[PDB]
Amino acid sequence: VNPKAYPLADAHLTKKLLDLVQQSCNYKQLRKGANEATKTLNRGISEFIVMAADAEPLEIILHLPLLCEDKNVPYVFVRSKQALGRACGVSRPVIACSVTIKEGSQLKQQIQSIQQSIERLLV
Amino acid sequence: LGKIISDNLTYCKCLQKVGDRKNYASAKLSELLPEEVEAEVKAAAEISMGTEVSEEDICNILHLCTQVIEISEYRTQLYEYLQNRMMAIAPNVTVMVGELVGARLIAHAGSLLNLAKHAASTVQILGAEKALFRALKSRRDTPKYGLIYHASLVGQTSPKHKGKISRMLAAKTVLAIRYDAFGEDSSSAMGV
Amino acid sequence: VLLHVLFEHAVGYALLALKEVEEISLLQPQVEESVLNLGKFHSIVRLVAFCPFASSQVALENANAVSEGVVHEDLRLLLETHLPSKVLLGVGDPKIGAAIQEELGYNCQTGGVIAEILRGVRLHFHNLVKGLTDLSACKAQLGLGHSYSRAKVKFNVNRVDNMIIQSISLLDQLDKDINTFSMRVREWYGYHFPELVKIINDNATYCRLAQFIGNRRELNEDKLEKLEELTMDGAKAKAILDASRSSMGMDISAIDLINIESFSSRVVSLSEYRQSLHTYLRSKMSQVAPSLSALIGEAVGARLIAHAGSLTNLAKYPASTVQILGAEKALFRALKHSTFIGRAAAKNKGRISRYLANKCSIASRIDCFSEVPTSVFGEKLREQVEERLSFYETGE
Amino acid sequence: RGNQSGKNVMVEPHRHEGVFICRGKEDALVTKNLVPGESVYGEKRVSISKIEYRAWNPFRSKLAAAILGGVDQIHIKPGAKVLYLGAASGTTVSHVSDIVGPDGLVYAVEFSHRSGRDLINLAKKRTNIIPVIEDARHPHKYRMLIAMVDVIFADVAQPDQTRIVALNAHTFLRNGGHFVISIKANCIDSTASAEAVFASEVKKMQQENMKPQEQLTLEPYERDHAVVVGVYRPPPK
Amino acid sequence: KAGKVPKDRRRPAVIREPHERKILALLDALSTVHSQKMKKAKEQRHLHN
Amino acid sequence: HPSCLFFQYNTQLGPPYHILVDTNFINFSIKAKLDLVQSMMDCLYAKCIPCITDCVMAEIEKLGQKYRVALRIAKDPRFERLPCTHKGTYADDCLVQRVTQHKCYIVATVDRDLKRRIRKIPGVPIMYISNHRYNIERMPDDYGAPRF
Amino acid sequence: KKRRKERQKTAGDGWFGMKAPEMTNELKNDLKALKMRASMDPKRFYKKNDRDGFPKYFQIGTIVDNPADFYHSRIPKKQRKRTIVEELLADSEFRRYNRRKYSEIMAEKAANAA
RNA sequence: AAAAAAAAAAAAAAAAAAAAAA
RNA sequence: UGAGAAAAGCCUUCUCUAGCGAUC
Ligand SMILES: [Mg+2]
Ligand SMILES: [Zn+2]
């Protein structure tokens, strides 16, 4: 594995993440794409960032971690873009996604747990 | 080096002589700098904060420093040319007010004949046109120095007397301007 | 309470001896003056040894060892020499204390009164070691702070974009600065031979020919033959002699001719430096951002970095904003600047610019975060736009 | 709208030393640029007639949010040595470097290697910033690089913020010095309430021989954040 | 009142350019509206108090 | 004005209640033989962690051996021991200052004079002993409080 | 006495030595305009002024262009002016609103005066 | 609060400036 | 408030910090 994809999730935590992405799309709380993920970081409306480590140039998504460290936003990698494609409800591979702040959303409890799990990966 | 050396021409020559800090110790700078200054210059060489520079970077710095000394050398040649023409066209003015200040006066008036048509009080305040029209509109006190401020006689005199010398210098100056413009003989006897 | 303290500094290692101290009430309002006031500190603490670092590289080696907690040979040499061999040695780091006690027989203590003594030493350090070292203590920390930081992150000095920022600005100034001088030269030589401005369409080219012929009085035979070599075509040079023979310009004085000759030469020497600056910029761009340079050219690519202010700032921008950086100068709209095979219709002029912005954003990211820069990706992206340009132009 | 480029505008000093107010149709907080002509994160700068000031964004900065909220003291003044924990990319660090001026020093600590490469590029242009790419939880590992400082600014955003500040304060902070700590309520304890968290952190600070003096919220810009200002080992009066 | 000034002593008045009066008229009209605005806000505060 | 308050309603007061105990509240609790932690749990149906300041603890110590039982109950590992650096021993001023600063505590006291001061501070409940049961005054989520 | 006078001519070391500009009818016109910024736009409200008098130390300048803000925030070069007063003279929105209010005040005053 | 005086502006208003009552 | 109020120049009495000094 390329060492630049440091927060690589295991099998169990990947299942929880891709389930939460599929839930978020139904509640209109997901922004899809590398450019759209960047824009939410500027506006400070992201809980976390999910990126695909199987992009053939890994460098095209490495600008997102730099923005995350300033906003103190957790971020993780997954092993497949095509698996990330279906969970987002899109018919094309996706290399980056961002879940948005929504006031009063019922996803807060599930989101709060997944943020804590990501921070544990960084020990 | 920038703090220790203020002479810009001396600074650019030192860079041309010595590229990196390592060459400062071995090379000698007696011809460019005093030995006491050279010792301090060599003293700063070992205790330095700067980053090391590549070979392509140091070449570009030398080329820029090459152009600096060539422009400065030409500027001195241009200044000497100006002194040659000024002493040939209006020699009486150059002796009295100076080469630079007399040259600016013709540049403001645009020609020697146009400057000749002016009176004595106008020559005094040729430079100070902004203070004059501000004073006349607001009914304040008019300026008194003009371009004459940088003349040799005005510079040496005391600040209390710089008002008197301004009109005394200007009034005699126009006697030199008329004589050079209309006289058919080139001599500095009247100016002296 | 007599004990020894080891203090590590950027300039070197120091060994100090403690005579007496009121240990229990040290952290109290009245007693705290014992360490704060310089005179009282000198009463109870002396400097028994000092071994400064010889060079910056040596200082970096000791900094690595101290952070890891191992006993470097420089530290061991000082400790063995001036310490009698029932010895208490104070250290700020528990790990270095254990390593010393394994290497040598001294007893190490890491806390208690020693923690307060070390702060007293740190606050008054510049006074104790003043004049013992050539390089100042304040500069010692500033110099070491960088070299320690470069080592951790594997910084590469080649891949820095300071020079391209300065070079683009300097190119802008030179283009104006040569232009102003070139117009003045043409006016001055116009008094002597006004026809020359009509034949020559280039300001720079006018300058060498101003050098080459001093007066129109002597331009014939071999000097005419020399003239055809500098001029691009032989036909004009034969007309130049005809213009020189029949011209209404005025003879110039001696001292006036020497002035204009030296001045016209200086514009040439300024122009040749400008060509060298453009050469130096091109070499820098391949080392810094090869993929972007291959995509759009060294001139446009460097200017895009200049608008962003840095290479990293260019990568962080989204695809939408990178188009705006070229809006005022029409970097993406104006295509021949960047030259691409094929041409874009007026209807699809906006679409090609939008598509080209996305490719430049991707190429900029590859240059910034690659372990080694390589221009293969830029060439691949160049081909794709050309396929798109042919797609719109031919319809397939 | 806003402050469009090319508008006449006035710059007057703030109550704090080294900080300026950009008086116009709208008012912005500005600091004097140490390196004229350069923007570190794309802010709008103002040219004054050889002198230039840079706008300070309170949404992207935690110190600027406190100043706009009306904090009494910041203790960052020209010619002061400031130890910064959690420098990140250097958005706030650049403005702190502007306040201290050429005489003062800023010690920037950032563990991450990705953001560390940005500090070194930033420290190249500013001579008074000393980059320290090291973990803030172990102050003994970089005791070579740092002398005594006057102010410690903490933006580490960790569950153990107080312990990290306590270790660094004992080792490097001079007697009578001051500290500014930003507290993110969601970071220390998400389960407990935000207001009870602010009471717990203050309690721990008093157990570490630190005397907190003031606190305030940053509500118009941030939610569930607080800034605490205090003094370390005060001199007797 | 002391309105009278002799013929020899009196000075000609200032003759303003058209641009200056446009700037000068703007400020007085602006100040009248602003002075009116503050006075109205004064009574609202006093009534509420 | 603090952000925790929505007019007179304290939102950030949470199911873990931090309670500042006055020195007199301890004495009457023993006289009525009410367990200090257990009775608070019955009043609020939630976890309660009483808080003991340095000022309050000193006033117990000055009372003498006659009040030794109250002193031993005060040192209970389940309790929260919070320090205060206040030049003196008087505790009423200590508690109101803690109340004014943070707005997260519930005041437990039986003195009438202290209660009338705390009522002037918005958004802070007061706990007092009524009959042989604990009672709460200005709390919306009182739940299992004496009904009268 | 003379050393006091030298120290009051500058803001001090705390603010990097700002100098007090000489007071002119153009600078004073600018300061009066800024003090009355509340009534420029009926839909915008402002806080109270910090000080009743004019500031002693201040400097005047213009905001630098930024390349990324070509469309978002940039005034075209023809609309730019030299002074704050001339900017107020140019825009139609302010002139239209100010004229309508000022006409009302005179008319209401005329009813009171008669 | 109020009777004044000195300036500008708009088709009267606005800034300063004194006295008197309270 | 009522050694009336306001301004300039000379002596007298004292207050704060900041280095400096304690290393034999
Ligand atoms: Mg009591
Ligand atoms: Zn207390």
Curated annotation (Swiss-Prot), chain B:
Ranges where the Nop domain occurs: 89-192
Tissue: Ubiquitous.
Subcellular location: Nucleus, Nucleolus; Nucleus, Nucleoplasm
Name of the featured protein: Nucleolar protein 58
Region Sufficient for interaction with NOPCHAP1, residue ranges: 1-192
A GO biological-process term: rRNA processing
Biological function: Required for the biogenesis of box C/D snoRNAs such as U3, U8 and U14 snoRNAs. Part of the small subunit (SSU) processome, first precursor of the small eukaryotic ribosomal subunit. During the assembly of the SSU processome in the nucleolus, many ribosome biogenesis factors, an RNA chaperone and ribosomal proteins associate with the nascent pre-rRNA and work in concert to generate RNA folding, modifications, rearrangements and cleavage as well as targeted degradation of pre-ribosomal RNA by the RNA exosome.
Disulfide bridges in this chain: none
Assembly mode: Core component of box C/D small nucleolar ribonucleoprotein (snoRNP) particles; the core proteins SNU13, NOP56, NOP58 and FBL or FBLL1 assemble stepwise onto the snoRNA. Interacts with NOLC1/Nopp140. Interacts with NOPCHAP1, NUFIP1, RUVBL1 and RUVBL2; NOPCHAP1 bridges the association of NOP58 with RUVBL1:RUVBL2 and NUFIP1. Interacts with PIH1D1. Part of the small subunit (SSU) processome, composed of more than 70 proteins and the RNA chaperone small nucleolar RNA (snoRNA) U3.
Keywords from the named record: Isopeptide bond, Nucleus, Phosphoprotein, Ribonucleoprotein, Ribosome biogenesis, Ubl conjugation
Shown residues within the full chain: 194 to 385 of 529
From Swiss-Prot, chain C:
Gene Ontology terms: cellular component: box C/D methylation guide snoRNP complex; cytoplasm; fibrillar center; membrane; nucleolus; nucleoplasm; pre-snoRNP complex; small-subunit processome
Superkingdom of the organism of origin: Eukaryota
Covalent crosslink: Glycyl lysine isopeptide (Lys-Gly) (interchain with G-Cter in SUMO2): 226, 236
Entry annotated with the keyword Zinc: no
Domain Nop, residue spans: 288-394
Subcellular compartments: Nucleus, Nucleolus; Cytoplasm; Nucleus, Nucleoplasm
A biological-process GO annotation: ribosomal small subunit biogenesis
Residues where Phosphoserine is found: 310
Coiled-coil region list: none
An example molecular function term from Gene Ontology annotations: cadherin binding
Modified residue annotations for Omega-N-methylarginine: 343
Assigned keywords, A-Z: Acetylation, Cytoplasm, Isopeptide bond, Methylation, Neurodegeneration, Nucleus, Phosphoprotein, Ribonucleoprotein, Ribosome biogenesis, Spinocerebellar ataxia, Ubl conjugation
Broad class of where this protein is predominantly found: nucleus
Family as reported in the entry's similarity comment: Belongs to the NOP5/NOP56 family.
Function: Involved in the early to middle stages of 60S ribosomal subunit biogenesis. Required for the biogenesis of box C/D snoRNAs such U3, U8 and U14 snoRNAs. Part of the small subunit (SSU) processome, first precursor of the small eukaryotic ribosomal subunit. During the assembly of the SSU processome in the nucleolus, many ribosome biogenesis factors, an RNA chaperone and ribosomal proteins associate with the nascent pre-rRNA and work in concert to generate RNA folding, modifications, rearrangements and cleavage as well as targeted degradation of pre-ribosomal RNA by the RNA exosome.
Name the record gives this protein: Nucleolar protein 56
Native source organism of the sequence: Homo sapiens
Lineage: Eukaryota, Metazoa, Chordata, Craniata, Vertebrata
Gene: NOP56
UniProtKB/Swiss-Prot annotation, chain D:
Crosslinked positions (Glycyl lysine isopeptide (Lys-Gly) (interchain with G-Cter in SUMO2)): 7, 25, 32, 50, 62, 77
Sites bearing Phosphoserine, chain numbering: 39, 47, 49
Description of post-translational modifications: Ubiquitinated. Ubiquitination leads to proteasomal degradation. Deubiquitinated by USP36.
Catalysis: reaction(s): L-glutaminyl-[histone H2A] + S-adenosyl-L-methionine = N(5)-methyl-L-glutaminyl-[histone H2A] + S-adenosyl-L-homocysteine + H(+); a ribonucleotide in rRNA + S-adenosyl-L-methionine = a 2'-O-methylribonucleotide in rRNA + S-adenosyl-L-homocysteine + H(+); a ribonucleotide in U6 snRNA + S-adenosyl-L-methionine = a 2'-O-methylribonucleotide in U6 snRNA + S-adenosyl-L-homocysteine + H(+)
Main location: nucleus
GO MF annotation: an example: histone H2AQ104 methyltransferase activity
Chain positions found as N6-acetyllysine: 25, 44, 124-125
GO biological process, alphabetically ordered: box C/D sno(s)RNA 3'-end processing; osteoblast differentiation; ribosomal small subunit biogenesis; rRNA methylation; rRNA processing; snoRNA localization
Substitution effect: residue 44 to R: Decreased acetylation; restores ability to methylate histone H2A
GO CC terms: box C/D methylation guide snoRNP complex; Cajal body; extracellular exosome; fibrillar center; granular component; membrane; nucleolus; nucleoplasm
Keyword Methyltransferase: yes
Consequence when changing residue 44 to Q: Mimics acetylation; impaired ability to methylate histone H2A
Enzyme Commission (EC) number: 2.1.1.-
Keyword Nucleotide-binding in annotation: no
Record keywords, A-Z: Acetylation, Isopeptide bond, Methylation, Methyltransferase, Nucleus, Phosphoprotein, Ribonucleoprotein, RNA-binding, rRNA processing, S-adenosyl-L-methionine, Transferase, Ubl conjugation
Residues given in the record as S-adenosyl-L-methionine binding sites: 91-92, 110-111, 135-136, 155-158
Chain segments carrying region Helical: 193-225
Curated annotation (Swiss-Prot), chain F:
Domain PINc: from-to ranges: 17-116
This protein's record includes keyword rRNA processing: yes
GO MF, one annotated term: RNA binding
Covered range of the whole protein: 51 to 198 of 198
Function: Part of the small subunit (SSU) processome, first precursor of the small eukaryotic ribosomal subunit. During the assembly of the SSU processome in the nucleolus, many ribosome biogenesis factors, an RNA chaperone and ribosomal proteins associate with the nascent pre-rRNA and work in concert to generate RNA folding, modifications, rearrangements and cleavage as well as targeted degradation of pre-ribosomal RNA by the RNA exosome.
Location(s) in or outside the cell: Nucleus, Nucleolus
Statement: the UniProt record of this protein carries the keyword Kinase: no
Family as reported in the entry's similarity comment: Belongs to the UTP23/FCF1 family. FCF1 subfamily.
GO CC, alphabetical: nucleolus; nucleoplasm; small-subunit processome
Domain of life: Eukaryota
A biological process term (GO) from this entry: endonucleolytic cleavage in 5'-ETS of tricistronic rRNA transcript (SSU-rRNA, 5.8S rRNA, LSU-rRNA)
The protein's name: rRNA-processing protein FCF1 homolog
Quaternary structure and interacting proteins, as annotated: Part of the small subunit (SSU) processome, composed of more than 70 proteins and the RNA chaperone small nucleolar RNA (snoRNA) U3.
Keywords: Nucleus, Ribosome biogenesis, rRNA processing
